[model samples]
Target: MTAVRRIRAAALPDLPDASWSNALLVGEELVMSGMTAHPATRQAAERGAALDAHAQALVVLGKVKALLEAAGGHVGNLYKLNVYVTRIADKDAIGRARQEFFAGQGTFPASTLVEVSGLVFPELLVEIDAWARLDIDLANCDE
Candidate 1:
C-alpha cells in the first residue's frame, strides 16, 4: 500500500493545532477535514460584521476546493461532502452557495447536510467534510 501524504493548501489558513491535518492524499483520493470560515470570519466579526449561510458556505467550500487542488485534483474530482450547520433553517442559503460554487460542474457531489452543534468557531455557520478521488467523473459512468 502506498503511504498517504498530508496536504496543506496555500490558500487555507494554517491549522493552529498539530493534532489534525487539513487534508490527506491517499493515492488519487483526498480525505478532507471539517473546514469552516474561522479566522476569515474572525476578522469580519471583529469589524462588527457577520456572515450569512451563503457566505459561510462559500468560504468552507472554497477551502475544500483549495485542498483538492493541493492534492492534484479539481472540483470535478469531488464526489462526496458531509455538511454540518448550526441551524437547520440555513439549508436553502447553503444550497444557494452550493449551486453558485459548482455552477459549471458536470454534477454536484453526493452530499449530506445536517444541523449540528458548535463548530470550531461559534461564528461559523457551516462546516464541510469532503471526500474526493481523482479521475472519477461523476457525470460519466465507466465500469
Candidate 2:
C-alpha cells in the first residue's frame, strides 16, 4: 500500500476546528473532503450564502477543482463524485450545475446522488465530495 498524505488547498475556507483535511493524496488518487456553499463564513444561510441547490453545487464543484489543482490534478481527472442533498427533488438542479462544470467533456466521472436528513448547517441544501487521480509526473506531492 502507498503512504497517505493530507493536503489543504490555498484560500479555501474550512471550519476552524474541523477534524479533516481538505484533500488526501494517496497513491495516485486524490480524495477530497465534502464541500458546501458556506463561503468564508462557513455558516449555513449566512447573511448572503446561496440557498439554492444549483448555486450550492456550483460552489462545491469550484472548491473541488481548487483542491485537485493544488495537488497536481484537475476536475477532468475525477473518477467519482458523491453528491448529498437535503432534498431529493433538487437533483435536477444539481445535475444542471454539474453539466455546466463539465461542459464540452465527452464523458463525466461516475457520480452518485444521495438524500440526507441534514447537513452541517440547517440552511445548507447540498454537499459534494469527489475523488480524482493525479495524472502528472511529479517526483513529490504538495500539501
Candidate 3:
C-alpha cells in the first residue's frame, strides 16, 4: 500500500486557493503540481498580459524549487521535469532561464518540453511540473 502526504511550502505562493495542494509527498517521491506565473506576477509585469516566456518559465521553476525545499529536498534532488509552452519559439528563452536557475550546477534533471495549444490562462506562456526524491530512509520500514 502507498501512503500519501500533503506538503505546503510557506515560501511558495498559493495557487489562488485551489482545491489541490501545491505538492504531494507520496512515499519517497515529491510530486509537484504544474505551476504557472502567479497572478501577482502577471499583474506586476510591465507588459501585463504580454509577459515574456522567459519570465514565465522562471516563475514556474522558482515554484518548483520552493516546493522541493518544502519536501526536505532541493533542486539537486530533482529527477525529472516536464515543461509545457504554447510557442515552440520560446524554447531558447526557456533554456536560458533554466541554465541560470541551475546556477552552473554540474548535473541537471532530465527534462521534456512540449508545445501546448494553450494553458489555464490565455496570458500564461509556460507551465512546469517536476518530480524529486525526498531524503527518507525506507530501510526503517519493516517488511
Candidate 4:
C-alpha cells in the first residue's frame, strides 16, 4: 500500500481550499505546490517598494525549502523544480538566486523555467514548484 502524508511548514499557511496541500509526501518523495511571495510582494508594493525577480525568486524558493525541511529533507534532496516567471528576461535573476540558494549543495535540481502570462497575484513575479526525495541526496553522490 502507498502511504501519503500532507506536509506543512510554520512559515506557510494552509490553502483555503482543502482539496490540495501545499506539499504532499508520497512514499519517500515530496511534491510541492507552486510557491509565490504573494502577501510579501503586495506588502512591499504597498510600502512603495517593489521586489525584483531576484528577490521574489529567493522568497519563493525559501518557501519551497521550508516545505522540504518540514518533510525531513534538505534542499539537496530536491531533484526537480519548475519555475514560472512573468518575464522571460528575469531568467538570469532567477538563475543567480537559485545558485545562491543551492550554494555548497553541489548538485542542483533539474529545472524548467518558463514565462507565464501571469500568476495568482498581480504582485507576484515568480513561482516555484519543487520535488524532493528524503532518501535521495544528490549532493552526497560522487561525480
Candidate 5:
C-alpha cells in the first residue's frame, strides 16, 4: 500500500513567526507549495501588501530549506524549481540569495526563472516553487 507523510515546519528562531511549506511525501517524492517572502501578516511594505522582490525570493527559498529538512530531505534532492520575478533587475538579488541556499558544488536541480510584469500583490518581489525527490533506502524495512 502506498502512504503519504505530511510535514509542516516551524518558523526559524531568527525569523519572525511564520510557517514554511506544507509538504506531502509519497514514496520518494516531496511535493511542496509555492513559497514567498511576504511577512507573517502577508504585508511587507507599510503602504502596500507586497514583499520585497529579492528579499521575498530569499525568504521563500529559506522556507523550502526548512520544509525539506523537517521532512528528512535536503537541497541535494531538489528536482526542480520555478522562480517568478516582477523585475529583471531583481535577478541579481535573487542570484545572491541563491548562493546562501544552494552550494554550487553539488548537482543543482532543473530550474526556470520567469519575468512577470506584476504579481498578485503590487509590492511583492518574487515567488518560488519547488519539487524534490528523496532517494531513500527501504532496505531497512522489516519483512
Candidate 6:
C-alpha cells in the first residue's frame, strides 16, 4: 500500500482562528473543506448577477486553486468534486460555467451536485467541496 500523506493548504486571506490555508492535502490529493461563498455577501444565497452561482462557485474554486498551487499542485489536477446548491434548476448553468472555467484543460474530474436547505452564508446559493490528486502513484498494489 502506498503510504498516506497529509497536505494542508492555508487560506489566501486571514481567517478567524484559522491558518491562511483553507484546505488540507492528503496523499497527493487535496480534500477541500466545504467552501460557502465569497465573504462579499456573507450570506450564501441571494438575488445577484445572472451568473450568481457560477460566479460564487468560481470564487470558491479560485481559492482552492490558490491553496493547492501553494502546495505544489494546480487546478487541473482535481479528480472529483461535490457541490451543494439551494436550487436544482441551476445545475445546467453551473455545469456550463464549469466547462468554460476548465476549458482547454485536458483533465476533468468526476463531480456531483446536491440540493441543500442552507449553508454558512444564508445568501449564498451554493457551496462546494472538492478532491484533487496532484500526484498519483500507481506502482503500489494498494492505494
| TM-score of decoy 3 | 0.82
Model 3, span 14-50: residue lDDT tens: 5676887789899888878898886745585645455
Clashing pairs for predicted structure model 1, backbone only? none
In order, candidate lDDTs are 0.84, 0.79, 0.79, 0.89, 0.70, 0.67
- lDDT by residue (44-140, candidate 2, tens digit) is 4556654588878888888898998888787777778899999999999998998898874657777899999999976678888887888742222
Candidate 5 global Cα RMSD: 7.4
Error of 1 at 42 (Å): 1.2
- Across residues 43-138, which tens digit of lDDT does each residue of candidate 4 receive? 999999989999999998889889988989888888988999999999999999988998877778899999999899999889988888899888
- Top candidate by lDDT: 4
* Model 1, span 1-143: residue lDDT tens: 87798888998745687678888888887888788988788888888988888998999888888898888888888888888999999999989998898887657888898999778777888998888998786656423
How far does residue 138 in candidate 5 sit from its true spot (Å)?
Answer: 20
The numbered model that scores best in TM-score is 4
What's the TM-score of every candidate structure? 0.91, 0.83, 0.82, 0.94, 0.72, 0.74
Better of 5 and 6 by TM-score: 6
Q: In candidate 5, which residue pairs get closer than 3 Å at backbone N, Cα or C atoms, i.e. clash?
A: 53-125
Mind sharing the TM-score for model 2?
0.83
Worst 10 residues of 2 by lDDT: 134-143
Residue 67 error, candidate 4, Å: 0.4
Model 5 scores a TM of 0.72
Off by over 4 Å in 4: 16-18
